């Protein structure tokens with residue numbers, strides 16, 4: 373049946389388990405520490421930089437073509453938030469953590485061997501970002517007592533003026549992917565792995 377439905381129903385438990393980290397529990401209670409939050413953005417910087425490198429590389433893949441959504445890219449939003457927190461963010465002074473490196477390796481290796489599985493990476497990260505952004509930006513601003521419009525670029529999509537319409541269009545796009553039900557199962561298996569890789573980076577904080 374529907375790939376968007378398969379992924380939603382198939383990853384409901386993984387979404388819940390990704391909050392077993394104390395970083396996320398406190399974030400959900402409205403508690404964040406500046407230093408820890410900034411390291412959390414560093415891990416996402418490396419992840420999205422790699423994912424966007426690989427999605428651009430595979431943009432004309434027949435399966436990925438209909439989910440070519442540069443509107444969702446986060447690398448530049450992350451850089452901007454990193455500059456707000458650090459003043460000047462030097463990547464060589466803040467090299468990727470062990471869990472970040474394993475996540476980037478997964479992205480790279482998937483891109484070169486099974487690029488259709490990058491659909492799982494797009495789903496887990498971007499559809500989550502679009503779904504949670506408005507809520508998470510308010511929680512983060514309140515937790516860190518942030519100035520108006522600063523340090524929350526990661527949660528904002530200036531290229532998308534209708535978030536609700538885009539989320540619907542995204543799920544319709546997932547359902548349009550030219551993949552069979554067996555291939556959708558492989559996309560679900562990858563999505564579960566992505567949730568685990570996110571739990572891995574959260575575990576470090």
Ligand code: HEM
Pocket residue numbers: 376379380387390396495496497499500501503504507508567570571
């Ligand atoms: C690893 C952490 C997380 C990942 C990978 C993630 C991923 C996702 C994904 C992929 C969806 C889309 C589900 C679907 O429509 O099929 C989603 C939905 C959602 N997520 Fe998360 N999520 C995470 C954590 C959080 C956190 C911390 C919040 C706190 C607000 C949150 C709030 C939501 C909400 C409210 C939705 C549903 C939005 C809607 O239906 O309008 N998530 N998430």
